[PDB]
Amino acid sequence: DHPLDRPVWNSLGGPQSELDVASGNLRRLDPAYGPFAAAAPGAEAGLASLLQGDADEIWLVEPEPVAPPPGTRVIRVAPLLQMIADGPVPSFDDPGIVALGETDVPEMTALALATEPGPWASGTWRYGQFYGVRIDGRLAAMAGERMRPAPNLAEVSGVCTWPEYRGRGLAARLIRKVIAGMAARGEVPYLHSYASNASAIRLYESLGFRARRAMTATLLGKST
């Protein structure tokens, strides 16, 4: 099957294998980076073993909903549309977009926790390159890189903008910058949207992404 059919499994067994903290037929992203996990086909019972504290949870990204094995419960199930940008990136020079780094982490963290960038843990900024835009000296918006299911695939993630800076085209410009870097390295961008986000899908289509397939994000917690 395609590397993007199991992006958590494949990234953690592939280019990002140093981020895997589990063993054997379970793969678990270092929690400093994010909440993602995956099981070998047939080995899903072991997912419960990744959930010890009462409030622990794991996100899975698979073609179908993951059934809660014994010791677990489904908290959320989110239909996704997975998209790929495998056509040429038109060049777009945008010097207002700045690379982010360690000194920006407090501000990145505030933005991420306040908006909907997806999961954001203490070390998520280390997952790959992040870019930002600053307005009145504030970090207005950001976007970055995340999973790498194979050497030539790279995920666009962490796209978020403070409400007060929305409607100015920042997200589009940040996505452009991220995919330019991927392009420079000969990598193909991909991303997930919620299937429900009609607006976002149109934005991504306008930035060169096409629908690849439906996927499902499952959030598992401990059974009560």
Short mmCIF file of all heavy atoms in Angstrom, two decimals, residues 31 71 122 191 219:
data_model
loop_
_atom_site.label_atom_id
_atom_site.label_comp_id
_atom_site.label_asym_id
_atom_site.label_seq_id
_atom_site.Cartn_x
_atom_site.Cartn_y
_atom_site.Cartn_z
N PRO A 31 6.04 11.51 23.28
CA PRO A 31 5.04 12.48 23.75
C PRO A 31 5.45 13.95 23.75
O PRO A 31 4.54 14.83 23.73
CB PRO A 31 4.75 12.03 25.17
CG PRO A 31 5.09 10.58 25.17
CD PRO A 31 6.20 10.40 24.23
N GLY A 71 -9.75 -2.20 27.54
CA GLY A 71 -8.98 -1.29 28.38
C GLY A 71 -8.98 0.11 27.82
O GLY A 71 -8.30 0.99 28.36
N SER A 122 5.14 20.07 24.23
CA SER A 122 6.31 20.90 24.55
C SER A 122 7.35 20.93 23.43
O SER A 122 7.99 21.97 23.21
CB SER A 122 6.95 20.36 25.82
OG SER A 122 7.33 19.02 25.65
N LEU A 191 -1.12 16.76 3.44
CA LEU A 191 -1.74 17.24 4.65
C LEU A 191 -3.05 16.54 4.84
O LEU A 191 -3.54 15.87 3.95
CB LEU A 191 -1.94 18.75 4.63
CG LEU A 191 -2.78 19.34 3.48
CD1 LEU A 191 -4.28 19.17 3.73
CD2 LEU A 191 -2.44 20.83 3.21
N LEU A 219 -9.26 9.05 18.49
CA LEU A 219 -8.72 9.38 19.80
C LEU A 219 -9.21 8.35 20.81
O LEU A 219 -10.43 8.22 21.09
CB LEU A 219 -9.15 10.81 20.21
CG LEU A 219 -8.56 11.26 21.55
CD1 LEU A 219 -7.00 11.30 21.47
CD2 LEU A 219 -9.18 12.64 21.87
#
